[PDB]
């Protein structure tokens, strides 16, 4: 239970007798680019690609890695374990049925470098009776002979945007089998018009 995708954009829709908002998932259809047979990679699983960026551009290696079970002419590829390939090509034109619950993730839009301000919560310090730092700045960092020094792992300023992550459950809402697309009402995990993936896990007993 997994879908590979080019995440489109977020937008609003309606359901039953009320509007609410969704997101645009789009995925041509990855294919058995590589299989870890188990005897192969006893971490058995399926690795696939789902599109194709120019052919005149392509390392030999790629060319033949493909050769393998041979498939097509793309570059978007990655892998996931414990997921059979009751096919040798997958789309979602059904692959992913709506009115179902899902879990999913993607690249995480890339922030900047902001301290106690950003990075973490609590917006900085205070402002007025003190302005030799006006409004916000760095909290405190340890002490005299307690550990006798500077700590080792509390939040910290800077770069906190160039990373990746995911979201737990979300809704499958709707399936557009033609233009391999699906509306899901999602935390648009990470950008849009870029890269994402979906997987489904949740033996959740309410």
């Amino acid at each position: 239970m997994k879908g590979i995708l080019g995440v489109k954009v977020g937008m609003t829709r309606i359901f039953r007798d009320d509007r609410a908002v969704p997101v645009t998932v789009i995925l041509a259809g990855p294919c058995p680019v590589v299989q870890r047979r188990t005897p192969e990679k006893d971490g058995y699983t399926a690795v696939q690609l789902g599109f194709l960026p120019q052919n005149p551009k392509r390392v030999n290696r790629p060319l033949k890695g493909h050769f393998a079970k041979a498939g097509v002419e793309p570059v978007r590829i990655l892998r996931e374990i414990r997921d059979f390939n009751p096919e040798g090509d997958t789309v979602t034109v059904e692959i992913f049925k709506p009115g179902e619950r899902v879990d999913v993730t993607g690249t995480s839009k890339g922030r900047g470098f902001a301290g106690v301000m950003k990075r973490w919560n609590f917006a900085g310090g205070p402002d007025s009776h003190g302005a030799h730092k006006i409004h916000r700045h760095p909290g405190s960092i340890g002490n005299r002979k307690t550990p006798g020094r500077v700590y080792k792992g509390k939040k910290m300023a800077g770069h906190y945007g160039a990373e990746r992550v995911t979201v737990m459950n979300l809704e499958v809402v709707d399936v557009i089998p033609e233009e391999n697309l699906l509306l899901v009402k999602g935390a648009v995990p990470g950008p849009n018009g870029g890269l994402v993936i979906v997987r489904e896990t949740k033996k959740a007993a309410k």
């Binding site: 937008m11 829709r13 007798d17 018009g193």
Partner: protein
């Protein structure tokens, strides 16, 4: 392709025209009935009149606060396609300049001024 494309599409799918009703006009206080309901599916062709205020525009859009003097000032904001709607008929005039968010209205209005426009 991309966004523009595909999306344009899905929406077209659901909203279709918000129900061809393309009577915007800046001013015009006017009146409609939304399904707005509850209690024993009392979805009521409820009609509120309101002096036309603003709007959101693209797939999702909204015929904005049209302020209505109820006996206190109550401004009503409503999504456009939003299947929620049934009747939507204008009464007032699509006049006045400076464009929307002209809350001048709701704010310092004063019936007189109001008419002053």
């Amino acid at each position: 392709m991309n966004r523009g494309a595909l999306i344009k599409l899905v929406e077209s799918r659901y909203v279709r025209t918000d129900l061809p009703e393309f009577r915007p006009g800046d001013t015009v206080r006017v009146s409609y009935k939304v399904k707005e309901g509850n209690r024993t599916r009392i979805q009521d062709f409820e009609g509120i009149v309101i002096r036309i205020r603003r709007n959101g525009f693209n797939t999702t859009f909204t015929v904005r606060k049209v302020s209505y003097g109820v006996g206190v000032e109550r401004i009503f904001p409503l999504h456009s396609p939003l299947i929620q709607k049934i009747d939507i008929v204008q009464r007032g005039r699509a006049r006045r300049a400076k464009l929307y968010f002209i809350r001048n209205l709701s704010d310092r209005e004063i019936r007189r001024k109001l008419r002053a426009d």
